[PDB]
Design a protein around this nucleic acid. Structure first.
Ligand SMILES: [Zn+2]
Ligand SMILES: [Zn+2]
Lengths: 56, 118, 186, 69, 143, 49, 92, 56
DNA sequence: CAGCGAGAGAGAG
DNA sequence: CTCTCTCTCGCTGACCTCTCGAT
RNA sequence: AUCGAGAGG
């Protein structure tokens, strides 16, 4: 992230979210979680399409 | 390897062997100038290159905010202000060995205990 | 500004990573076959091989870049003058040489310049491109990524309406010219 | 207090000012306005001239800057 | 594992060693081409020590390969065995000396008996397979 | 190609702060790259900071 | 005045940013457990500071209440639903 | 509960300390060679497993 | 995009 | 030679429902 | 009709 210093391999830099959903995600944690959710939705749509073709 | 181009026509020199006295001289084709070769090795090829573990280290490189700052110090500078980067070369086999540059020594100091080369 | 034509220049490093005789050839936009980078440099006027390697490589010390260049330097040792390098271009004589110079000014690095006398800057930029190609081949630097938002540009309504307006205005301009050509009576 | 550094609650006021001047559709309006003011005249001027050549002779048409009602 | 062989960590290591593809390109740190006019005297001191080792009982250009210790430690291959495979492929077209495995720095020197030597070096790194099933790149041990 | 690029970039940043250099135009220097890229191009998203 | 600057992504690669203006002031204890854990920035120099983190979010995300406490896919679904939701678009 | 929350944060902190020690050992290059995987790959897998166990 | 359907293009006996 | 790969290069496929706005 | 866009699961 642009806030993170260069060459950081720490879990916070790499996206590990210490906080719970109740305590709340940090902005960096929220962006990384958004990346994960985006991949999830794209994969879900692709899975639906592929499985429809496969079933047919 | 050292690559030599002839001075008169600025074209690359090609190796040539004098058989009678058994030595290697560099002769250029674009112009007739021939010279004695100082280095024995005509061609080298590194399957594994440590070259480029540090690339483009400048004095100004010590000032950039993006680069991280470390507590450790080189024995030569004896100044802690330093920049540590992982190897610029992108390899399948890459060492996470920190390379540090401090401005006062302008000397690169390497975290790994195994290798003290260069 | 004016007519905008996207131009794609391909610099290719032939041969596998394990394979020998790695050669660099770049294909010109108007020429069917990729010509060697050194042949292009000779056509540019940067004739000495050392000068070509100096344009390509900014630091003299590294052996690897020069070693990779050597097969191309051997390929370009066959053509040692500007006129022949310009001559051996495309498919179709002296007209081919002149058309080669025209192709070099209009199609090779068109964004930098379209006119003659600017060959040195274009050659230095071309050597810079070969340098980046070699940095990736050496695996010192990783390949550039397409999905980088800074490289992406988000065209708004205005510019697209602008190109549409250019097309419409060109059609109307042509039509006015047709009316004038059609009648001398008015 | 003019020397003292800001807080986040102060940063919201700068955000406020930015939103007031730009609005929320600033990009659309800016691109359109630049297109009308400058881009239109440049487009008209490029390839403007129409020249008809007769062997005997030559007629030239150029374009003044564009005015938008 | 073969029937009746369980807890054979050693035998599984040997099987892994036998099946993984090993190339001269995999083991070599570096390929270097020197020109050495005299077979007896080389410019490199380590090669001269190897020469004095070779007191028992052609082209002057020579190819010197430096191979990684750690790869040899992981692999079943020994430097003598590697040189033997090179010799089997060359059928005495070229002559090889191997620095001893006990030596800290290991140099494998090949003299043809310079374009031929360069293409042969490339051919040797890419095409020489040593103690390996062809299509397997990697094998790991698990329970 | 320019020598002493840090001083020139400092002056350029001061000009952009002044507004003499347009705030939209982006000036980027990397020291390893030894590269300075100036982009007056339209259509690049920028954020105020 | 030059107190604020506009940064492109290519320019953004070269800069170092702090989310919170309270990160920069010097930090020489008891903490409420509910407050989310914040990793120390531990950075000497920041070129710029983000005006507010919530600005990375969109208009529909700005509508969403406590999306930091919420999971992101639900936030996306709610953005779409909020476009779908009824409302008085204009006074006229 | 607050007590359980303190144990939670302590667990996360211990995971982070182990991760940083593993990273230091990687920096020292005093890290055992693992057959069939790059050493960076082993580092990534160990850190990922550390975080997974911390969450669980 | 891949395979399978072809056809150049050798090709190593 | 020469069938025998063998390395190229073409193409054809990939769940319903409800608006609307343009032609 | 067609095409396009959007939205729902
Ligand atoms: Zn010469
Ligand atoms: Zn130092």
């Amino acid at each position: 992230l642009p806030h993170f210093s260069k060459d950081d391999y720490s879990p916070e830099s790499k996206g590990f979210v210490e906080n719970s959903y109740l305590r709340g995600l940090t902005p960096q944690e929220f962006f990384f979680h958004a990346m994960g959710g985006r991949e999830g939705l794209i994969d879900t749509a692709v899975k639906t399409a592929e499985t429809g073709y496969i079933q047919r | 390897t050292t690559f030599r181009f002839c001075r008169d026509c600025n074209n690359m020199l090609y190796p040539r062997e004098d058989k009678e006295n058994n030595r290697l001289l560099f002769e250029c084709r674009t112009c007739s100038y021939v010279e004695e070769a100082g280095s024995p090795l005509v061609y080298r090829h590194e399957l594994i290159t440590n070259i480029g573990e540090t690339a483009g280290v400048v004095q100004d490189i010590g000032s950039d905010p993006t680069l991280p700052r470390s507590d450790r110090e080189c024995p030569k500078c004896h100044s802690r202000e330093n920049v540590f980067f992982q190897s610029q070369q992108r390899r399948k086999d890459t060492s996470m060995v920190l390379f540090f540059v401090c401005l006062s020594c302008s000397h690169i100091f390497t975290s790994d205990q195994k290798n003290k080369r260069t | 500004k004016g007519s905008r034509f996207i131009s794609t220049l391909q610099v290719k490093l032939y041969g596998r990573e394990g394979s020998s005789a790695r050669t660099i050839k770049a294909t010109l936009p108007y020429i069917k076959q990729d010509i060697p980078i050194v042949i292009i440099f000779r056509a540019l006027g940067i004739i000495p091989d050392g000068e070509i390697l100096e344009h390509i490589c900014y630091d003299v010390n590294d052996w690897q870049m020069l070693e990779m260049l050597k097969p191309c330097v051997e390929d370009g040792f066959v053509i040692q003058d500007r006129e022949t390098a310009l001559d051996f271009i495309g498919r179709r004589k002296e007209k081919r040489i002149q058309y080669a110079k025209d192709i070099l000014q209009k199609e090779f690095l068109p964004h930098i310049t379209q006119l003659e006398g600017f060959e040195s800057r274009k050659a230095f930029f071309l050597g810079y491109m070969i340098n980046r190609l070699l940095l990736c081949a050496l695996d010192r630097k990783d390949q550039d990524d397409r999905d980088h938002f800074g490289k992406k540009r988000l065209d708004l309504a205005g510019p697209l309406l602008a190109q549409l307006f250019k097309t419409l205005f060109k059609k109307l301009t042509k039509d006015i010219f047709r009316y004038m050509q059609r009648t001398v009576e008015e | 207090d003019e020397s003292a550094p800001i807080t986040a609650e102060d940063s919201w006021a700068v955000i406020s000012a930015f939103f007031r001047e730009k609005g929320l559709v600033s990009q659309q309006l800016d691109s359109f306005n630049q297109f009308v003011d400058y881009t239109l005249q440049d487009i008209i001027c490029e390839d403007s001239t129409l020249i008809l050549e007769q062997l005997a002779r030559k007629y030239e048409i150029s374009f003044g800057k564009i005015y938008v009602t | 594992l073969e029937p009746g062989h369980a807890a054979d960590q050693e035998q599984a290591k040997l099987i892994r060693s036998a099946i993984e593809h090993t190339t001269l390109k995999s083991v070599t740190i570096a390929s270097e081409i020197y020109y050495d006019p005299d077979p007896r005297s080389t410019v490199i001191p380590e090669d001269e020590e190897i020469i004095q080792l070779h007191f028992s009982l052609q082209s002057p250009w020579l190819l010197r390969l430096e191979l990684d210790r750690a790869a040899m430690n992981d692999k079943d291959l020994t430097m003598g065995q590697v040189g033997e495979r090179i010799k089997q492929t060359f059928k005495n077209d070229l002559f090889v000396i191997w620095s001893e495995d006990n030596d800290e720095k290991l140099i494998i020197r090949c003299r043809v008996v310079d374009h031929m030597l360069k293409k042969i070096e490339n051919t040797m790194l890419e095409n020489i397979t040593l103690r390996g099933v062809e299509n397997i790149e990697r094998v790991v041990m698990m329970k | 190609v320019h020598r002493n690029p840090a001083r020139l970039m400092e002056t350029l940043r001061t000009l952009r702060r002044k507004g003499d250099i347009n705030p939209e135009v982006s000036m980027i220097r990397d020291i390893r790259e030894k590269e300075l890229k100036i982009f007056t191009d339209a259509g690049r998203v920028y954020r105020p900071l | 005045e030059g107190l604020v600057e506009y940064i492109d992504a290519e320019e953004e690669e070269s800069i170092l940013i702090a989310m919170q203006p309270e990160d920069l002031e010097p930090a020489e204890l008891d903490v409420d457990p509910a407050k989310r854990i914040r990793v120390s920035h531990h950075a000497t120099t920041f070129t710029h500071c983000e005006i507010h983190p919530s600005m990375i979010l969109g208009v529909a995300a700005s509508i969403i209440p406590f999306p930091d406490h919420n999971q992101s896919p639900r936030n996306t679904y709610q953005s779409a639903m909020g476009k779908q939701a009824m409302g008085v678009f204009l006074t006229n | 509960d607050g007590p359980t929350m303190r144990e939670i944060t302590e667990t996360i902190a211990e995971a982070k300390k182990k991760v940083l020690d593993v990273t230091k050992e990687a920096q020292a290059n005093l890290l055992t060679a693992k057959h069939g995987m790059t050493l960076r790959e082993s580092f990534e897998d160990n850190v990922v497993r550390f975080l997974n166990e911390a969450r669980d």
